[PDB]
Amino acid sequence: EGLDKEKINKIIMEATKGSRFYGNELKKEKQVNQRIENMMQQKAQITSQQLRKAQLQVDRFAMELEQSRNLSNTIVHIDMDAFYAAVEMRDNPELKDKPIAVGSMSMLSTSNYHARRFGVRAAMPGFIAKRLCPQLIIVPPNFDKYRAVSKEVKEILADYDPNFMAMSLDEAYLNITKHLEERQNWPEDKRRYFIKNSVVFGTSAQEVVKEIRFRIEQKTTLTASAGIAPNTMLAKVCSDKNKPNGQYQILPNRQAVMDFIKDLPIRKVSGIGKVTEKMLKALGIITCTELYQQRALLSLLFSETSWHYFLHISLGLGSTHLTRDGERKSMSVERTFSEINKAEEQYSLCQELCSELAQDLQKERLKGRTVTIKLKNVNFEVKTRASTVSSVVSTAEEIFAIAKELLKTEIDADFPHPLRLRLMGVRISSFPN
DNA sequence: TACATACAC
DNA sequence: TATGGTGTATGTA
Ligand SMILES: Nc1ccn([C@H]2C[C@H](O)[C@@H](COP(=O)(O)NP(=O)(O)OP(=O)(O)O)O2)c(=O)n1
Ligand SMILES: [Mg+2]
Ligand SMILES: [Mg+2]
Ligand SMILES: [Mg+2]
């Protein structure tokens, strides 16, 4: 079963239009459309002489990148399929051959592929999703299970790269280069696994990943998809290609890299989001070769780091070694609620959040100098207000002391109107080096 | 240092 | 009735 690609957007708009949420989404779209219009004003003021001057600067840098292109590493991205929903499907048979999503009626974490055919997706509210699919089954989340399932897969992955990078519970990057070296001359004993009556996997990168996905399915009863490529950026993209329950390899030769990139929409790259797509689209840029073609223009319209990034993407480049993410930069907590307008209640809720945050800091023995409150009113508009201090702070009292005054300032500023808020949050940052 | 925006899960 | 939460990067002032 399923729905129509056009029936869907009609039901969403019909369900969402008029809400305070939609009002804020319009306010954001206008703010983006204006930011596009400003970029187009600059494109008109760009001279053919400037374009030539930049083109010569870009290609000089592009040659520096191209000559340092590293194809000697083998990078695997593993990504669980419909992760949360797959777990709930695994442990309740009644949800076999049925559309489901994990979450509440207010919000969904994810949805299984059956339900995806109706247009129900991650980050969608349940009440909207039920309009799209009345038979939809919303099952409450069990994060503790998901963490436990994750732990099972992370244990398998550690055989192939002990320094693998877990991006989240369902997701990881592996550098299997060093494993492939050792494995080249392994006996069938060291790469044989029994079915839950046994099987052997080859010496190749494709085979190594078939073993990983198999061992995962055997240990957890859940499928994963995987991507294989000479860098992280490519690997991530490939893992999505034959999803669910499939692989893809970009072989480690320059030509194959380029063939894959040629007509690849830039959205699919990790870091190109909804906005960057819409901005670049207005410059006629959709695919990665179009992104290469316009590289000069981009070096005049965007900041150094952004066009440097776009160039890496346009040449099929990316990170080839996994850096153990070291010290953290911020710790935070925030919560949504039904409207709170009484000041005394807002101080109480601030104090609560500061306590929870101090508790989380205690766990990692951390102290910081910057305390930042986050306030979101009933029309979904967001303010952050910060304050940095000489001496590091950490206790619930110390953090609350600072956040109290920031919140006071904001209540005082709108006076005599009360703050009609729907979410508050507190963040700490500026830990010592 | 302060604030907003964009992005990822 | 209803649109969640944590963390990093970065552009600007
Ligand atoms: N916005 C989001 C995105 C994901 N998640 C959770 C639910 C997902 O199952 C899990 C992993 O994210 P994900 O890999 O992007 N999606 P999911 O594994 O469900 O489907 P696939 O597209 O990978 O098959 O994080 C969330 O709670 N909020
Ligand atoms: Mg996934
Ligand atoms: Mg994921
Ligand atoms: Mg993207």
Side-chain angles (χ1 to χ4, degrees), chain A residues 79-84 109-110 113 116 122-123 170-171 243:
Chain A
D79 197 326
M80 296 282 146
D81 303 318
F83 188 41
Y84 291 6
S109 310
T110 189
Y113 285 89
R116 287 180 198 191
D170 97 310
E171 194 161 304
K243 177 169 275 287

Side-chain angles (χ1 to χ4, degrees), chain A residues 266-273 309:
Chain A
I266 77 281
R267 191 59 158 81
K268 299 296 187 71
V269 187
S270 182
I272 309 303
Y309 169 61

Side-chain angles (χ1 to χ4, degrees), chain A residues 215-232:
Chain A
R215 287 178 69 181
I216 284 163
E217 179 162 26
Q218 290 306 286
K219 182 137 262 289
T220 67
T221 332
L222 301 168
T223 59
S225 298
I228 312 165
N231 62 69
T232 51

Side-chain angles (χ1 to χ4, degrees), chain A residues 205-273 275-323 326 328-349:
Chain A
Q206 279 265 15
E207 286 292 291
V208 167
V209 175
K210 285 182 182 154
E211 183 176 283
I212 286 165
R213 297 204 305 116
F214 172 78
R215 287 178 69 181
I216 284 163
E217 179 162 26
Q218 290 306 286
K219 182 137 262 289
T220 67
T221 332
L222 301 168
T223 59
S225 298
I228 312 165
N231 62 69
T232 51
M233 177 260 153
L234 291 177
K236 178 89 167 72
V237 176
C238 303
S239 83
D240 200 67
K241 189 143 170 66
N242 295 344
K243 177 169 275 287
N245 199 10
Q247 296 175 197
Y248 189 88
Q249 183 173 31
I250 294 168
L251 284 156
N253 68 79
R254 194 196 178 282
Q255 192 52 42
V257 171
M258 294 304 156
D259 285 14
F260 189 90
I261 288 303
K262 192 173 160 289
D263 294 281
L264 174 61
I266 77 281
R267 191 59 158 81
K268 299 296 187 71
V269 187
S270 182
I272 309 303
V275 172
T276 306
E277 189 183 21
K278 196 178 177 193
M279 288 206 300
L280 292 177
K281 188 177 172 180
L283 308 183
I285 309 169
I286 297 186
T287 73
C288 290
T289 38
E290 290 172 353
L291 194 72
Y292 183 65
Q293 286 163 2
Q294 304 281 0
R295 64 192 175 285
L297 175 54
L298 292 168
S299 78
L300 305 175
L301 297 177
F302 291 95
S303 64
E304 209 186 350
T305 49
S306 289
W307 75 257
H308 279 208
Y309 169 61
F310 296 142
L311 190 65
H312 278 90
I313 306 315
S314 60
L315 297 172
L317 273 20
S319 205
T320 60
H321 66 267
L322 313 185
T323 55
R328 71 156 63 230
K329 310 206 176 167
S330 65
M331 202 175 275
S332 69
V333 46
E334 72 189 47
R335 191 161 302 124
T336 297
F337 34 74
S338 49
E339 184 178 334
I340 301 174
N341 46 50
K342 294 194 164 53
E344 192 179 328
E345 296 180 12
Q346 297 162 350
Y347 286 105
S348 283
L349 220 125

